[PDB]
């Protein structure tokens, strides 16, 4: 229902979905999931990212423009954004 945006052309927006859904099935604890998403996105694009996973949580963060992606993945919610 909510989809905060990022850069154009689906360089990044397209990548995150495809990766997240390998991630959700392949593990059970959030630890390996968030670690896996962050560990991939550091190698591909940028030097320091931040990721959150869960069914329910409040949050409010500072970041770099057009690098904030938030999406409801299945029952879970996944949050991702660069910083640093």
């Amino acid at each position: 229902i909510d989809m905060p945006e990022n850069s154009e052309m689906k360089s990044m927006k397209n990548d995150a979905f495809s990766q997240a859904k390998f991630a959700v099935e392949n593990y059970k604890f959030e630890n390996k999931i968030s670690s896996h998403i962050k560990k991939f996105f550091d190698e591909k694009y940028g030097p320091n990212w931040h990721c959150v996973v869960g069914k329910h949580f409040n949050a409010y963060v500072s970041y770099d423009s057009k690098n904030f992606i938030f999406f409801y993945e299945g029952q879970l919610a996944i949050l991702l954004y660069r910083k640093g």
Binding site: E30, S34, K38, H50, C51, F57, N58
Partner: protein, 95 residues
């Protein structure tokens, strides 16, 4: 083992400075108590991060709720993680 503190359950040995810790520990239940309730969401964490940026160093992130979990890099010795009455609170700084 989540040792008890006069605020709430905090994982020890602490990975944050004592003054910063005490500030967080007292501000959370003060700010909850005075004119704030559990029904409201974002407008808490709003105030918490504002309070930290006013006095302490400028760049903070706050995450709290009833279920989540994260890995994250952060400035050295600037990690606050605590439960209070089955509610997880997490905060950290980045340059």
């Amino acid at each position: 083992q989540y040792k008890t503190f006069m605020g709430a359950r905090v994982l020890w040995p602490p990975e944050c400075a004592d003054d910063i810790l005490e500030g967080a520990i007292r501000e959370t239940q003060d700010a909850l108590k005075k004119f704030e309730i559990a029904r409201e969401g974002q407008k808490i964490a709003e105030h918490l991060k504002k309070y930290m940026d006013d006095h302490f160093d400028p760049y903070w992130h706050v995450f709290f709720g009833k279920n989540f979990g994260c890995q994250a890099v952060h400035n050295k010795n600037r990690f606050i993680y605590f439960y209070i009455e089955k509610t997880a609170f997490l905060m950290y700084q980045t340059q």
